[PDB]
Amino acid sequence: VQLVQSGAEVKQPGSSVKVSCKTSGDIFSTYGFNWVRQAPGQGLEWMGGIAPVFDTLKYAQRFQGRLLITADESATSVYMELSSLRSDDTAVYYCARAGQGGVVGNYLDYWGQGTLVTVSS
Amino acid sequence: DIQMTQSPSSLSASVGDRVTITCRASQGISNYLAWYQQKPGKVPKLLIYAASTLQSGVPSRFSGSGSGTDFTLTISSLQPEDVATYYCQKYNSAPLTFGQGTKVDIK
Amino acid sequence: GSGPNTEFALSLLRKNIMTITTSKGEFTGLGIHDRVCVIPTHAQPGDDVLVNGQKIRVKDKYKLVLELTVLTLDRNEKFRDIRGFISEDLEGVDATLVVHSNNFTNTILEVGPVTMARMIRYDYATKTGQCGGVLCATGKIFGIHVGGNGRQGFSAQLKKQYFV
């Protein structure tokens, strides 16, 4: 199982960031995927998830309205786009597979390598 | 919202010590609880799901227990490679909330 | 009542599980992929069926190689490809039965552990009007409910070989 994420990003407050997560294609068409972030020295924070096979979408209330999670079958990838960036959004963003298949809400058994997003100010 | 709280938030123990970390959910989540280990500078890694089922490959010194609101992760003999932050997470339904984490170090 | 089993069942209701009406009444039907779906053979589909109340022409129908019949429908919408979920690993599994027909619309019954007996058997007092219900668990579709004896229900087993 492989989850390869896009590279580090530097952004200014008020802009937006898009992070991608690529998987094999068998996995993309059967599993769900979640976005989890981690600010420097802090804990894990669930952001949202997508199961492309069923267009299942889930968003954490804390990000509702400024987070868009999407999927592209041709690229076998899922995406997160976070807008209105503030400096407290400086964090490592993780893509993770939900277990068993067909669902967003499950334990997360494989994690991508993470993408650092640095918001200056 | 909902609270997942862990206790203690950090501890320092000796190699070979029995270590116990608890997790409390503000609402009952039956046994939809997972435990993750994040070693320094590494990505989180699934240790336990369904509250007490070991992920395959995880050493048998790790064990989980509980159902409903009160959960426990035990390391029966603390090893140097176990230095890490441990997180609980509910997945009864969204949000898939993480506890605040318990940092485990060795003197 | 929650957990990933419920989410899986609800997503299947959203994308792949329909009410199929034949001259014999309402049954639950399972879309497999493309325009292929499955119903109990007892439903005896003719040249037209209702799919959630819409009249749809049946392009092709055939029995399988066990009380299950495969229909190719003359329909615009395609089914989400759920073939990757078809599983025969059912032991140690607390399953759900998802029905969407008669008075049991959007119905998720937790039927407990399931075993082979050959059909899949589950200990749950089934009512009539649930035929076609999809026997599943998180990421796993096991079979189609085709009857019971008043204290157990029985499902015809689904296999990946049935769909090329």
Side-chain angles (χ1 to χ4, degrees):
Chain A
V1 185
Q2 279 248 296
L3 303 159
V4 178
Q5 306 187 214
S6 59
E9 304 240 13
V10 180
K11 294 281 183 189
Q12 310 285 127
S15 48
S16 94
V17 66
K18 192 167 188 179
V19 180
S20 66
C21 180
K22 191 175 210 333
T23 189
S24 72
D26 271 287
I27 287 168
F28 170 97
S29 67
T30 37
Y31 287 83
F33 305 86
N34 283 270
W35 288 102
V36 176
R37 80 174 185 182
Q38 180 169 53
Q42 292 192 299
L44 294 175
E45 184 173 41
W46 180 73
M47 304 180 57
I50 185 171
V53 61
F54 297 127
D55 296 334
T56 314
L57 274 150
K58 265 118 164 61
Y59 291 109
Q61 202 158 277
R62 294 53 66 165
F63 302 108
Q64 174 66 47
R66 77 177 180 109
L67 175 58
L68 174 64
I69 294 176
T70 58
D72 186 293
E73 173 153 73
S74 147
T76 61
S77 294
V78 303
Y79 307 86
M80 59 154 278
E81 190 159 35
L82 184 62
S83 299
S84 315
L85 288 175
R86 50 221 61 174
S87 60
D88 63 71
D89 292 322
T90 294
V92 168
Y93 290 79
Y94 292 107
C95 183
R97 190 182 81 163
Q100 298 186 274
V103 297
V104 173
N106 212 3
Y107 58 82
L108 313 175
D109 57 359
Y110 292 90
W111 294 63
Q113 82 274 27
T115 303
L116 179 66
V117 176
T118 294
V119 185
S120 44
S121 193
Chain B
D1 268 283
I2 72 92
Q3 279 75 42
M4 306 284 296
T5 66
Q6 299 173 226
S7 190
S9 39
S10 68
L11 65 102
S12 294
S14 312
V15 156
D17 281 1
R18 174 175 201 93
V19 168
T20 300
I21 298 167
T22 66
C23 178
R24 188 165 280 193
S26 45
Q27 85 254 65
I29 54 161
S30 87
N31 72 336
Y32 301 123
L33 182 99
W35 287 101
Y36 300 90
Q37 170 192 70
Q38 186 179 35
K39 299 197 197 194
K42 310 295 218 54
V43 317
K45 153 184 189 212
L46 182 54
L47 288 194
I48 285 152
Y49 58 93
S52 61
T53 295
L54 272 285
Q55 176 67 317
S56 90
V58 180
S60 44
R61 67 176 179 278
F62 291 94
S63 52
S65 95
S67 190
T69 56
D70 294 313
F71 306 84
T72 293
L73 174 73
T74 309
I75 309 170
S76 68
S77 180
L78 188 63
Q79 298 304 305
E81 57 269 37
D82 303 326
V83 170
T85 305
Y86 296 82
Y87 298 92
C88 55
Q89 184 208 30
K90 76 182 195 61
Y91 55 95
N92 60 315
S93 73
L96 316 179
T97 310
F98 290 95
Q100 88 272 17
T102 297
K103 180 157 139 105
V104 168
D105 269 280
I106 283 153
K107 183 178 179 180
Chain C
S2 54
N5 263 271
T6 302
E7 187 193 319
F8 190 68
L10 289 167
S11 293
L12 281 176
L13 285 161
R14 200 157 38 75
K15 293 306 214 186
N16 289 74
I17 292 174
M18 321 137 294
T19 316
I20 295 192
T21 308
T22 77
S23 74
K24 290 195 69 151
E26 275 179 16
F27 301 76
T28 300
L30 176 52
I32 300 295
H33 73 97
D34 197 3
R35 278 120 200 177
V36 171
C37 73
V38 166
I39 47 177
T41 292
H42 185 244
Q44 291 168 38
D47 287 309
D48 300 294
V49 300
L50 304 191
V51 175
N52 288 344
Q54 192 167 20
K55 183 167 279 204
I56 305 300
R57 181 177 101 76
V58 174
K59 241 300 179 169
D60 187 48
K61 38 175 180 297
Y62 63 86
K63 303 177 169 69
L64 273 183
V65 285
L66 68 157
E67 307 267 58
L68 287 191
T69 290
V70 184
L71 314 176
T72 322
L73 316 173
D74 194 357
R75 208 179 177 214
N76 303 322
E77 298 68 4
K78 271 174 149 105
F79 293 116
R80 293 306 176 92
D81 191 352
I82 48 78
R83 289 178 282 181
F85 302 126
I86 299 168
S87 162
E88 302 170 43
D89 189 2
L90 46 135
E91 303 271 348
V93 189
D94 280 10
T96 61
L97 185 75
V98 188
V99 317
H100 190 73
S101 58
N102 300 302
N103 38 295
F104 312 102
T105 62
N106 302 119
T107 297
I108 304 177
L109 310 172
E110 252 286 358
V111 297
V114 300
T115 177
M116 302 284 319
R118 284 172 203 159
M119 316 229 75
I120 309 161
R121 181 198 352 138
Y122 30 99
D123 305 335
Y124 177 93
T126 37
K127 298 158 220 165
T128 61
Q130 291 165 345
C131 286
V134 185
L135 187 80
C136 52
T138 308
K140 287 175 176 192
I141 298 181
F142 297 122
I144 303 298
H145 174 87
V146 292
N149 56 27
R151 307 247 203 160
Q152 280 96 79
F154 296 100
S155 275
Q157 181 166 244
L158 282 173
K159 288 183 171 89
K160 273 178 194 194
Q161 32 186 86
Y162 303 163
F163 323 93
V164 78

